[PDB]
DNA sequence: TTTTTTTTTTTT
RNA sequence: GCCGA
DNA sequence: TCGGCTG
C-alpha cells in the first residue's frame, strides 16, 4: 500500500469533521473524530468513537460505536467521491515511481530539556512524621521504610504541575497525591507520577512528563549489577532488587536498557488476554520473562502478594531467580499458564 | 548467520547450486531476513537465477512493505557482501543453521498443538493436528539435510542396487505355505499388513486365523479388538487351535475336562508363544493407546509383542486427527500412517483389516478402487489382501484372495487363489 | 487437582489400588506438592501401606527440609480430606492430569536437550541425550494412559474364559424357533440388529411382532414409534396379542365385552411383562433423547426395558451431527453408532429397521449393498435380516427373510427362510 | 529503475540494440531522467553510436540546461555504472517499467482530455484530441511490448520454421532404424506416446527398452513407475544395458566384479545419459504430481529430462477427478489429456502404456476400434504402437508391432513390423 | 432462585432425577449461572452423574472464560449449599 | 476425499 | 462498545 | 467528567 498518501488524504478528508484531533505519537499516526456514519452520541461528543489508524501498512477507519471498520479508500468512495478519485488517481501516479518519503528523515527531538530540580508543595515520605495519613497508608502498603526516601506526598498536585508545566489544569484545585519522581540513568528526575491516594483520586491519575523525550522507566539510576527485573508498578519495583518499572501504556523494548539482562516480571493473571498478548509479544522477541505458573500465591502484583497472602520479598526474589525462561522454554510456560 | 547465508546466496554460485532447494522462508526470523528471502525466492521463480544487488533493490522498491520493513530490508541488502571463505565450512554451517531453525519452528508448532488441545470444544480451531501427531512432526525436523535422495539414479546409485540384489530382508513365515510363496518366505517386520474384505465376510476371521497360525509358530501375538469382546476373540482363537467348532463351544458339546486337557496339551508344547487379547471401545483406542498397551505388556505381563493384530482399522481413533474433524479419507489415511509408524517403531509385523466400498460387496472381483473409508491405505499399507466369498465360495466352503497390494513380491503372479476357510473352526486350510 | 489426588491417595484404598502404579515425582510440581508426594512414596516404601495424616506428619517431622518447604508441606498436609467423590470421574481426571504433566515434562526435556545441543561440546553437558532422542521422548510421554489391564491370555485365563462361555446371560430368546436357531440363543444385549425391508413390505410390522413376542416372554420392551402414532402402534400390538385381525378391530367384529375379557385374561398371566410405546416426530429423537426417555420411564414407573425397538433408524436425528450437516452416509452411520452405544450402555437388544434403495424394491432378493441409507449401518449392526415379498410370496402370505449379515452365528447355515407373516394380525408364524 | 536503464543503455551493446526501438523521451520523468535520455538521443542521432560516460558528460557540458537541471544531470551522469547484470531479467524489468510509465502517461492524457472537454467550447484547446479517440489512446498504451512474439506467425517466420525443418529441432531418434523409418526421424518433443499391450505383452518391458535406448543416446530419462519397485525397474534397465539376463541377476550367475566392471565401462562412455527411477503408489500419482517431481529433480539433482516414461497409463490418476476406477473410459481420457499437456508444457517426450480389448487379443490384426481405450487415448496420443505377441512369434523370439496411430507420419507406409524382442535381456533389436 | 435450583441440582438426587431432563442452558442468565450450568452439563455428559463441589472446582480450573467469569463462577459455587427443603 | 440419492448421458 | 482515572 | 482502545 501507500500509507503516507493514505494519511495525507485521511487528514484532508477528516479535518473538517467535528471533534477532529490529529493524535501523532512518535511512531503512530491516528485521527480522532465523531464518526459521520453513526454520529456517536450527543453526550459523547468528545468521546468520539471514530478513529483512523495510518501507522499500519494500510490506513483503516474504525468506529466502535457503529462497528464500521474499512480501508480509507472505501470511506473516500462512500463519502468523498471527488477526493476518492483524486486519491485513487494519485496512488497510481506515485505507484510507478520509487518512494521518496525516506529522503526528509529528520529527528525533531531534543535532549533533557525540563530537568526537574525541586518539587514545590511536596514533602518526601522519609521527611514526614510517622503518624501522617500517607505514612499510615503506605504502612498498609507494607513498603520497606528505607525506600521512603524515594516518594513524596503532596496536596497541591495541580499547583505543582502548573508550577512545572503551566496550563495543564485550568484550576489548581488542591489534591493530595503520592509524587513518585522518575529519574534517568544519571539520577536526575525526568518525570513524576501523581499516584492516587485513598481508594482512588477524583480525576486525572497520570504521570506528568517534564518533556516528551523524558524516560518512562522508574529506578534506572538505582540499577546495580546482575539481572534487571522489569515490573508494572513503581511501588512494586520498590520491593525488587535491580527492579525497574515502565510507566506508560506503550511498551517499547528499544527504550528499555539492559537488553542482555532485562527480565520482564508481569502480573499474575492468566486471564486478561491483553496480558497474554504482552507475554506473547515479549517471547516472540526471545526476551527473558518470569512466569507465575508455579507461584504458591494467587494475588495480582508482588505488593498484593505481600499485603494479602503475606509474601516476603526474599520469597519473591527466589521465585523470580528460579523462574526465568527464554525462547521455547519460555513459550512452554506461556502456553500452559495462559489457560 | 542469516546474513552470511544470504550473502553467499547472492554473491556465490556453487553455494547456491548446493544449498538452494532445501532453503525455505520458514527458516528465517520474521524481521528483515524473511522479507529478503521472499524477494530472492520471487526473483528466482521469475527468472531462474540469483539476482544481483541492483535487482534486489529494484524488487524492494517495487514491493509492498512497511516503512520499517523497507528500511530493514534495504539495510540488510546494503550489509550483504562477498566474504571470501572456504566452500566446505559454509555448506556445513548452513546445514547446521537450517536444522537448528527447523527444530525451533517444529517445537513452536508442537507447543501450538498442545495449546489447541487444551482448548475446550467449539472454541478450539482446526487445520491443526492433534497432540498425538506431535512426535511425527518432530521426526520430520530431525530429517532435514542437504543430501536429498529424490529417486534412484542409475549409473550413480549402483552399490545400493547390487546390495538389494544380493541381500534379502528377514521374513516372518506364515503357517500357510501359500502366503510364504506369494511373499517369498513371509512378511517383513516393520510392515503394516491389512486383510481387506466385505462386511461380515471374514475380516476378523482372517485376522484370527493369522493370529492362531503365528501363535502356533511360536511368535508373541497381541490381538486388539475394537468391535468384539475379549472373550469373543479368545473364543475364535480357541476354536482355531483346539479343532472345536464355535457351535460346539456355545452348545457346550465339549466338556470342560476335555477343554482343559486340550489347553494343557497346547501349553506343554515348547514351540508356543503367548497370545494376549485386549479390548477397547469403538473409537476409544489410538496408536498412542496401543503404545501404552505395549509398555504395560512389557512391564506388567513381561510380554514383548511380535505380531500386533488390530481388529478394525476404520474403527480406531485417528490418534493424530481430532475426533470427527476431517473427512473419512484423511482420517483413515492418518490411522494407517500411525499404525505403520507404530509397527516400524516396535519392529512388529502388524495386521489389521479394512472395509471395502459398497460397490465391491457381493462382487466376484475387487481392486484398489474399492476401499470404502480411504483409498490412501495401499499407499500406506505394505501388504493387503481381499476376501471375495460372495455367493458360491461359501457354498463350496472356500475363499478368494485378490492380493490387492503386495510390496513383498509380484502381486501379478499368484494374484487370486482359493483358501479353504472353515467357519466352524475359524481357520484357513490349503486346497492342495 | 493435585490436592484432590493426594487426598484420595491417602483417604482411599480403591484409588491407591489403581493409580499408584502410574505415579512419578516428576508429575506434580517443584514445590510443596513434590515434597508431599516424596513423603508418601518414602512412607509406602519403608512400610508397604498407605500412610495416615498422623503418620505423614511424623514422617515430615523426621524428614529434613527448609523452613519454607516445611511450612508449605505442613500447610498442604493440613488441607487433606476424605471427600468420597465418584471413582470413575476421579480416575479419569487424575489420568488427564498425569497426561498433561507428562506432556509438559517431555517438552521441557526436549527444550533442554536442544539448548544443550547448541552449546559447544566442551561447554555442553554429556548427561543429556542427543537430538535424535527427541521423537521417542515425546511418544513415551504419549503412552501414559491409565490402564492396568493387559487383557486376556488364552493360556493363563482359560478357566475364566470357560466360565464366561458358561454365562449365557447375554442371550435373549426370540419366542420363534427359527430365529433362535439361526442366532444360537437369540439376540444379545447392547447388540444392534437391523430388519431391513423395502417401503410397505412390513418393517414396522416385523418390529411390532418382535415387540409382542418379547412381551409374551416376560421382557420389558420399549417401542419407539418414529413414524406412526402411539394409538396405532398399540393397535398393532393388540392385533398381535389379543389375536384380533387389525381390520376386525375397525369393523366392530370384536365387542367391548370380548376385548375386555381378552385383556383381563392376558393380565392374569404371570409370564406377561410390560410394553411401553413412545411416538416421536420425524427427525427429533436419538440417544440423548432416548436416554432422557429412559430416565423419565425409570422415574415415573418401575420399568427397565430389556428390548429397545426403533421404528426406523433413518427417521432418527443424529446426536452430534445437525439435521442435515453432512451427507447421508456420515449422518446415518453416526446414528447407527450412537444407537449401538446406547444399547451397549443399557445392555438391551436394540432392534431397528432399514430402507432399501430403489434398485431392490421389487426384487426377489435384496443384498447388503441395497441399503438406502448409509453403508455404515450394515457395518455398525450385528444381526441383519432382509424382508422380501413378491407376487408369489404375497399369495402365499409368506415373507422371505434373508440372513444378510449375521454376527451371532453362521450366516450361511440357513441363509433364506420363509416366515408366516399374517398382515391382518401383525404376527410372524414359523413354518414347519 | 531509471538509473539502471540509463546505465545499461550507456554501457552495453546487446541491451541497447534490443530495447532502444521501444524507448521514448516521455517514458522517464520531467526532470533528470528526461534530460539524460534527451542527451542520449541527441548523441545517438548526431553520431550513430552509443555515447560513453565522458561523451555524455561532454554533451552535458555543451547543452541548454538550467542550473538545477545542470546539477541534476551531472549527478545522474556520475551515478551511471557498468554493472554486469543478467540479460533476461534486465529486459523483463525495463519492459515492465516502460509499460507502467506508458500506462501512466496514457491515463494522464485521457484525464486531461476529459478535463478539457468539460470546458466552454469557445475557450478550449484545439490541439487536444477529441473524446471519441480515448479508446484508441489506451490501446496505444497497451501496444507496448519489447518482444512481440505471440504464436507462430505465418509469412513472418518462414525462415525460423525452415530452420526448424532442416535442423529437425523436434525429432528425437530411437536408436532403432525401423522406428525412425516409421516416424520420419523419431518421436517429437512436447508429445505423448502409448504402447498398447495385447494379451500378456508386458507394458513395462517396452517402456523399459525405450527407456534404455533413450539412455544409450545420452538423453536424460525419468521412469515414473507405479506397478513396480524402483529396484525392479532399475534391474530391468540393468538387464537391457549390461547384456545380463534378468533371471541371471536373481540367481547370482553374474558376480559383483563383472557387474561393477560393466557399470564402470558404461560410465567411461561419454555418450551415456542419466536415468532417474522414481516410484509412486498405484493410483496415487496424477499428472500434477509429475510436475512437482520434475521441479524437485531440476532444483535438487539439476536433472533436466527430455524423456519421461510413465509405467502405466491406466494405473495412473487423473489430475482433477474425484471418482477413480481400475478401467474407466473417462479416467483414461483425462489421464491422456493431462499427460500430453504435461509433455507440451515441459517440451519433453512422454511415453506410457495401455491395455486393449480381448478382440485385439485373439486377433493378430488390431484395429483402433478393437481398443479398450479407443476414442479416449487415440484422441490425445500422438503415437500409438500396438505390441502383439503370438505363439509363432514367441517361438521365433519376435513380436508384431503395428503403428495404430502416427500423428508423425502416414499410417500405411510401414504399418506392421517384426521386432526382435529378448524377454530375458528386455531388449528390442531390428530384423534383417 | 437459580442458586437454589443449582444447589438442589447438585446436593439432591431426587430433585435432579426429576428436573434435569427439562433443564437447559438458556434458562438461567448470560452471566455466572449459565457458565455453572454449562460446567454441570458437560460433567453430566462425561460421567452420567451429578458432580460434587470439588469436581466443579476442577472443571472451573480447567476452563477458558475470563477472570470476571471465573470469579463469578467461583463465587456461585462457594455460595452453593444444601438446605433443609421439601420436594 | 467418500457418499448417497436422481437424472442424463455415453460407451460397450 | 471495553478499560483507566 | 475525560483519553485510548482492532478490525
Ligand atoms: N458364532 C458363530 N458361529 C459360526 N459362524 C460365525 C459365528 N459368528 C460369526 N460367524 C461367521 O463369521 C463370518 C464373518 O464374521 P466376522 O468375523 O465378523 O467377519 P468380519 O468381516 O470381521 O465382519 P465385521 O467385523 O462385522 S465387518 C460370517 O459370515 C459368519 O457366518
Ligand atoms: N391397518 C392395516 N390393515 C391392514 N394391512 C395393513 C395395515 N397397516 C399396514 N398394513 C400392511 O402392512 C404392510 C406395511 O405396513 P407397515 O409395516 O406398517 O409399513 P412399514 O413396514 O413401516 O413400511 P413403510 O415403508 O413405513 S409403509 C403392507 O402390506 C400393508 O398392506
Ligand atoms: Mg467381524
Ligand atoms: Mg413405517
Ligand atoms: Zn461510527
Output the keywords.
part of a larger assembly; 5 chains; A: alpha+beta; six-stranded mixed β-sheet; five-stranded antiparallel β-sheet; 10 helices; 16 strands; B: 432 residues; alpha/beta; Rossmann fold; four-stranded mixed β-sheet; three-stranded parallel β-sheet; 44% helix; 9% strand; elongated; binds phosphothiophosphoric acid-adenylate ester; binds magnesium ion; binds zinc ion; DNA-binding; RNA-binding; primosome (chains B, C, D); DNA-binding (chains B, C, D); DNA helicase activity (chains B, C, D); EC 3.6.4.- (chains B, C, D)
Any overview of this molecule?
This is part of a larger assembly, with one copy of chain A (339 residues) and four copies of chain B. Chain A is an alpha+beta fold and 339 residues long. In chain A, 29% of the residues lie in helices and 19% in strands. Chain B has a domain at 166-429: Rossmann fold (3-Layer(aba) Sandwich). Chain B contains 16 helices and ten strands. A four-stranded mixed beta sheet of chain B has the order 6-2-7-8. In chain B, strands 4-3-5 form a three-stranded parallel beta sheet, covered by helices on one side. Chain B has a two-stranded antiparallel sheet with strand order 9-10. Chain B is elongated and about 90 Å long. At the B-C interface, helix 6, helix 7, helix 11, helix 12 and helix 13 of B face helix 6, helix 7, helix 8 and helix 15 of C. Strand 1 of chain B pairs antiparallel with strand 5 (275-279) of chain D. Bound molecules: phosphothiophosphoric acid-adenylate ester (AGS) (2 copies), magnesium ion (2 copies) and zinc ion. Residues 203-204, 227 of chain C line the site of one magnesium ion. Chain A binds three DNA and RNA strands through loops. Chain E: Belongs to the helicase family. DnaB subfamily. Chain E: This is DnaB-like replicative helicase. Chain E: It comes from Enterobacteria phage T4. Chain A: Keywords: DNA replication, Early protein, Metal-binding, Transferase, Viral DNA replication, Zinc. Chain A: GO terms for molecular function: DNA-directed RNA polymerase activity; metal ion binding.
